């Protein structure tokens with residue numbers, strides 16, 4: 116039914132592997148989360164790849180927002196529609212002393228946005244938070260409705276399987 120099969124299911128969370136175009140095309144979701152920074156300056160990782168997908172519309176709209184009242188608290192998400200695609204720009208934390216308390220806030224913003232999210236594991240790339248830590252918060256917060264999670268590299272895939280195995 117859904118084009119791309121999940122590699123793993125845990126409780127109400129389903130895990131997928133691909134780049135942006137693969138997951139946007141292959142996964143059934145109401146909105147995709149972007150692991151953004153407080154500037155909504157999409158320079159790297161998933162943020163760049165989502166911007167490229169939208170052919171710059173995302174960055175253009177981000178600038179607009181960033182912008183109006185005013186710029187963006189760690190997070191705290193900003194929904195934008197780029198044609199069919201709804202992108203929920205959520206400011207995950209940088210690694211640091213409050214990382215857990217802020218991952219909690221970010222995942223809660225995600226879990227409380229209406230619809231089935233497709234989300235990355237926040238902060239686990241350029242922000243340098245341990246994948247398993249961020250994932251642990253994700254699962255703790257997102258404990259009711261169906262939520263879909265994507266990762267990118269085969270390394271991250273093994274990390275998810277292994278962590279979920281420990282549960």
Ligand SMILES: Nc1ncnc2c1ncn2[C@H]1O[C@H](COP(=O)(O)OP(=O)(O)OC[C@H]2O[C@H](O)[C@H](O)[C@@H]2O)[C@@H](O)[C@@H]1O
Nearest residue numbers: 134135150152159160161162164235238239240241242267
């Ligand atoms: N081309 C891609 N397609 C799909 N997923 C990707 C891609 N590139 C990176 N990802 C990543 O998305 C997830 C989160 O990684 P990052 O994008 O590095 O996000 P984060 O660690 O939250 O750091 C955010 C920072 O990086 C961006 O430049 C963004 O503007 C912000 O400054 C990771 O699971 C996964 O490796």
